[PDB]
Amino acid sequence: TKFPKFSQDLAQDPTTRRIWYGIATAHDFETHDGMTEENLYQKIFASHFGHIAIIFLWTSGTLFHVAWQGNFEQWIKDPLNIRPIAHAIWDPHFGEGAVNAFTQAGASNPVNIAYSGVYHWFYTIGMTTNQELYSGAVFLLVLASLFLFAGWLHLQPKFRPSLAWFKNAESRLNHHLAGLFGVSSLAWAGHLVHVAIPEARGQHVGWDNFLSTPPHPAGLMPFFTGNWGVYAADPDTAGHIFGTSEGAGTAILTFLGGFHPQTESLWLTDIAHHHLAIAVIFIIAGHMYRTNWGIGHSIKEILNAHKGPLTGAGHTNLYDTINNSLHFQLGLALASLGVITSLVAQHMYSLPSYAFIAQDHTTQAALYTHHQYIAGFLMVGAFAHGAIFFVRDYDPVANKDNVLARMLEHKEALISHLSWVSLFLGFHTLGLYVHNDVVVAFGTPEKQILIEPVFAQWIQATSGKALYGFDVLLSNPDSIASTTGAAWLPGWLDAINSGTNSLFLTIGPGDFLVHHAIALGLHTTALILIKGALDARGSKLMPDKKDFGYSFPCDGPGRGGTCDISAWDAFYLAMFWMLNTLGWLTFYWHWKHLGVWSGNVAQFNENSTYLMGWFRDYLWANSAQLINGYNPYGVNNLSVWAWMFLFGHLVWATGFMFLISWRGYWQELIETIVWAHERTPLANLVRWKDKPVALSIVQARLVGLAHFTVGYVLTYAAFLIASTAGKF
């Protein structure tokens, strides 16, 4: 069979364009030859199994490599002074100067220092040795196999689920909430009280004896009665030493609040109590919708009920709109997953749950930067598939006059306003920055415009941070909120008022401007993506755009010119802005924490209000150790990052080629090369099986953006790690 098998249109393409476009369309199952709706879902369902197995096979990889080539057993003896190892290094191109550099972390051979923070995670959950790790790698190896066989099984005729089975939203929700979320949470609470909490108190519990040692002196007697107070009997003391019995208690379910004083992380007894409480409220949550017993709701029925005088038809037929369109479903999922992924980033740097991780500055920097980038991708994609929905699945008849339709009905008002807010932020936020630069540059920094984050400062005050002295709610000992009373509060108030962690960092003028620069970035990225979706079906410049689909090169140079006019081109443009937003964002987090970790917060506080300060103090100054990874004198452990740094700058700039110079130049240049080949003697016997052509108009946009993105993260990643690993 001629590749691609799924598109006869592409298979006939006599040019090289066949190969590329075959790869770019392999996963758009909807556009395949003779694809039905039932066979679509069944193919997605099987594909999902194969994806899960790749995940478990990846974690097994880290678990196995830590156990095999890592110093995990030595690291748990002194997690504050030993560097955790990622994996071994096997490179025949290494020279003497290089082998001596990467021989580090006490290892006798060349290794890499791990920055994923998995050491801290494994340790905290009760991993003690390289035998539990390895045993963990194998279990996730057979679990993966479990799913790879399942996907194979459900493609067999006897097991193929019906289309009615995939469209059953009621039953999928009841199970995902009560089972996948609830029981899973209840099962982690079980692990925490059985393994993590005990093994943190020196008492080993594992597959050997767990079935014959209770996690508490009492044994489920207070539970089935109503005296749950006993499980919060004797907490771990302030002087508890993690890993040993010195200061350990007996409580399993506490609500202490704040951090463990040694490990500077949340109390396992709080973490345990958390997943227990959440489990319950998730199980009852999975009883909402109707199944085979009359009780429950129809989402359809309750959705159709919410209509009011100002929104016309309300939410009528929205059940079917969603349940019929996967791009709609995929959009909500990506949008939501992308927000909480940000929430993960924001909560894991300010409220660590892993012992001794708040001391590992590099991992804390990587893990935050990492998850924000992931979050940024998810948000673009959410809007991307949002636009695709309007192009391929939206039905104006069933959706007539409801809230979805009315978005389009006043799409002008939305886009123009979103455009104003962006212009509003952009003109002024840049305005103050450039005022300050000039003002400072003329030796008069006292003339700067420095606005106090009163609103954000006031927010901290309401949670008990008395530094600003607003005296409100929790920073008010007389308030009703402080006398509520007690429970978590003493631990929490101590946590928030020690300027020793990253819990509600003190904020000033520097923080005021960056947040507004960030707001510019969220509005503009949303301006692009939302416009790309609302105008996906048509504009005055192209009223029949929907007939052309989501992605297409353009509509010729007629009617003024129509370059980058498709919804796909709105995603492509938006990507540049999301990267930009993350840049400002991650720049902010890093430069501010560098000050924290140095006890020198005065640097960011006093120089972040003008942009030369960012350029001078953050970018130029912290590149010092990075760019010296290698030089005419020697080579140190930062050699890679130095080399990767350039590699990043290179890829980035190679992207400008595919982005600035467009096709026609290259199609002509190729023809001369094709001429040269056919005219060169001896080299004529070799005839290509595929006619060489220049990349397509869309292809070059995509490729150019891919370089730009790979260059963007690899460059910064090499800077974040090296600068923080060097300076600590």
């Binding site: 197995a53 196995f64 390289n130 190896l141 057979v142 993966a144 790879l148």
Partner: peptide, 30 residues
């Protein structure tokens, strides 16, 4: 023999997820 021969065996049981990835791959292809 905890982490000595443990490099082996682990490779043997790794043939299963590989082989089952190959059977799933040919079915998704069709």
């Amino acid at each position: 023999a905890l982490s000595d021969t443990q490099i082996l065996a682990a490779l043997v049981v790794a043939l299963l997820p590989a082989f089952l990835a190959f059977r799933l791959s040919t079915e998704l292809y069709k």
